[PDB]
Design a binder for this molecule. Structure first.
Ligand SMILES: [Mg+2]
Length: 212
């Protein structure tokens, strides 16, 4: 059962630029270890039914820009594709916005194994909060240690690995609780905390996933 590796377009360029050293083709989708995919749903105007991701209010309304960015992900988490991955017992998906570059995907294999073994639900592959962190070793890649630290109020959806049922549970709770309103990323953090979801931040993420 292959691990989906999903490119989410946020700028206009080919998905091959995100994975410049992958020698295959990346297939589109809407509505050897890896299945490379580009997810094209969840986009702006086509969202009369993404309204349940957000509360009725906020300001006058939330900016179409902030909503659009998070909607792309929530739509993916809430897709028939994901529920089918749950049916098919696929454990994790790798999700990367296409303004990132991952030159070397070999780190993913030992990282995914270690995540499985250590019951990690989310590996966030972009850092947000600066300052000293409490690191723990995740796994050794060739001759270098890969470290993580526990996530807090530093959610980013730029690039991450997530357990399929974890993604499904989060977006379902968002829908249940009436949609996001203000402090989108804070609320995602709180939902994860309430569910005792284990989110780790990849330390020195920039080494593995270069952000544009
Ligand atoms: Mg990004």
């Amino acid at each position: 059962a292959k691990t989906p590796v999903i490119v989410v377009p946020v700028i206009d360029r080919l998905p091959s630029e995100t994975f410049p050293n992958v020698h295959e083709h990346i297939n589109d989708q809407k509505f050897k270890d890896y299945a490379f995919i580009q997810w094209t749903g969840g986009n702006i105007r086509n969202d009369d039914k993404y309204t349940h991701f957000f509360s009725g209010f906020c300001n006058t309304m939330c900016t179409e820009e902030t909503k659009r960015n998070i909607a792309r992900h929530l739509a993916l988490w809430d897709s028939n594709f994901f529920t089918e991955l749950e049916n098919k017992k696929v454990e994790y998906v790798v999700i990367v916005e296409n303004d990132n570059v991952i030159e070397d995907i070999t780190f993913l294999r030992p990282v995914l194994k270690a995540m499985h073994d250590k019951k990690i639900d989310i590996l966030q592959m972009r850092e947000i909060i600066t300052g000293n962190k409490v690191k723990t070793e995740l796994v050794m890649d060739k001759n270098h240690a890969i470290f993580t630290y526990t996530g807090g109020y530093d959610v980013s959806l730029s690039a991450y690995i997530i357990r399929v049922t974890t993604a499904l549970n989060i977006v379902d709770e968002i829908i249940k609780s009436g949609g996001l309103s203000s402090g989108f990323y804070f609320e995602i953090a709180r939902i994860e905390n309430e569910m005792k979801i284990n989110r780790q931040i990849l330390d020195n993420a920039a080494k593995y996933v270069e952000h544009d």
